[PDB]
């Protein structure tokens with residue numbers, strides 16, 4: 001199944017933050033309406049924040065997280081969770097290797113802000 | 115029901131990261147085995163990463179998040195989600211006022227690391 | 229925080245299923261737009277299905293689950309999860325006693341159907 | 343990533359319940375410690391509970407859900423959620439066609455029981 005794709009309310013500001021847990025340098029691209037809106041990269045085996053930004057979901061509401069290492073797309077896992085019918089988390093993990101820890105790049109999207 | 119309390123695997127490294135979305139300065143306390151292990155603070159209405167830290171879950175694995183605004187405890191909402199039976203997120207939202215957006219301090223705990 | 233309240237897409241069919249794990253008979257009310265849409269009653273300490281019903285979210289999209297024993301409201305916990313940006317679960321637990329297992333009546337709402 | 347596989351605590355009672363939403367007959371097999379422990383079959387486009395059962399996770403705690411339509415495995419999506427650090431749901435969706443509603447067989451595992 002498709003992973004790392006989320007439908008947000010239109011024209012809504014959301015937060016996106018990425019962490020790294022890998023010997024490989026991670027590249028995280030955040031797409032809004034199929035176009036790269038933010039790119040984060042870095043390397044850490046200690047959950048270092050490799051990027052954070054506030055973006056706008058625009059008129060499509062379509063937000064996609066892609067993770068790549070040495071040009072090769074990582075395998076993604078994702079889900080959305082809503083707390084008290086108000087607070088949204090869109091969560092992404094990724095695997096770049098063979099140990100299947102799925103934490104090599106971790107991405108957290110949250111809304112609403114403000 | 116109790117919120118912001120999570121049982122992690124014992125003696126395990128986890129990341130804890132806090133975001134602020136309020137006019138009030140937020141104070142986030144992270145307790146490990148009922149003792150304060152980290153404290154983050156900041157003020158933003160634009161999802162500032164007011165703190166992030168790697169901690170060890172200790173002997174019991176009990177991790178608790180508490181949020182306050184100048185000594186006044188905020189109301190908490192929380193859940194844990196596990197992706198591909200491997201990647202864990204413990205999620206916390208909090209409300210310091212009356213608009214019930216529950217984003218005033220958002221806390222994300224993730225494991226495993228490395 | 230308010231629990232057991234969910235916003236569904238308008239005019240959408242959804243399934244609601246209730247399980248019992250308590251010595252007390254559980255009374256489960258499902259409200260749609262603040263009015264009774266379904267009521268289940270049953271007792272089991274072995275996860276028996278005490279009700280299942282296909283409902284329509286109608287014009288409001290507001291769905292609320294209430295659980296009580298002899299008219300006294302149980303404490304609720306709830307969250308919504310979305311898989312592959314398509315499949316929705318609205319989940320509810322309830323506690324009618326002191327042991328805090330939160331399973332006394334468990335309610336699962338799922339959509340889309342068909 | 344692997345989907346539909348969950349590690350439960352060893353020797354724990356759990357409920358498993360399968361719903362059908364497809365023109366095709368669904369077969370749901372539930373494996374514990376790699377051995378079929380329950381099997382449900384049925385066709386519905388109205389969220390019929392094609393089976394529910396109570397099982398024990400045994401010494402391994404390994405539970406796997408498989409879904410097939412006349413001998414072809416459906417594509418699975420899954421996640422586990424925990425509310426108030428106590429109530430667990432292991433959730434499975436599956437797709438047997440092209441529309442990607444991922445509801446063709448839906449399986450919900452819940453614990454604790456009693």
Ligand SMILES: CO[C@H]1O[C@H](CO)[C@@H](O)[C@H](O)[C@@H]1O
Nearest residue numbers: 021022023024097099101228
């Ligand atoms: C050395 O192992 C680390 O780096 C590899 C990539 O080389 C990851 O897949 C693995 O999970 C570890 O984080």
Ligand SMILES: CO[C@H]1O[C@H](CO)[C@@H](O)[C@H](O)[C@@H]1O
Nearest residue numbers: 114135136137138211213215
């Ligand atoms: C002014 O409104 C903002 O600040 C208050 C606290 O004063 C929050 O509760 C609210 O959600 C907004 O973030």
Ligand SMILES: CO[C@H]1O[C@H](CO)[C@@H](O)[C@H](O)[C@@H]1O
Nearest residue numbers: 249250251252324325327456
């Ligand atoms: C006897 O214990 C059972 O019934 C009570 C209600 O009396 C529940 O609260 C409890 O979790 C058990 O299911």
Ligand SMILES: CO[C@H]1O[C@H](CO)[C@@H](O)[C@H](O)[C@@H]1O
Nearest residue numbers: 342363364365438439441443
């Ligand atoms: C006719 O459409 C229905 O049946 C097909 C399988 O034939 C499913 O994939 C689809 O989601 C619908 O439930």
Ligand SMILES: [Ca+2]
Nearest residue numbers: 097100101102
């Ligand atoms: Ca890895």
Ligand SMILES: [Ca+2]
Nearest residue numbers: 021022104228
């Ligand atoms: Ca890793």
Ligand SMILES: [Ca+2]
Nearest residue numbers: 214215216218
């Ligand atoms: Ca608020």
Ligand SMILES: [Ca+2]
Nearest residue numbers: 114135136218
């Ligand atoms: Ca706020």
Ligand SMILES: [Ca+2]
Nearest residue numbers: 325328329330
């Ligand atoms: Ca109870």
Ligand SMILES: [Ca+2]
Nearest residue numbers: 249250332456
């Ligand atoms: Ca009970």
Ligand SMILES: [Ca+2]
Nearest residue numbers: 439442443444
């Ligand atoms: Ca389908």
Ligand SMILES: [Ca+2]
Nearest residue numbers: 342363364446
């Ligand atoms: Ca279907």
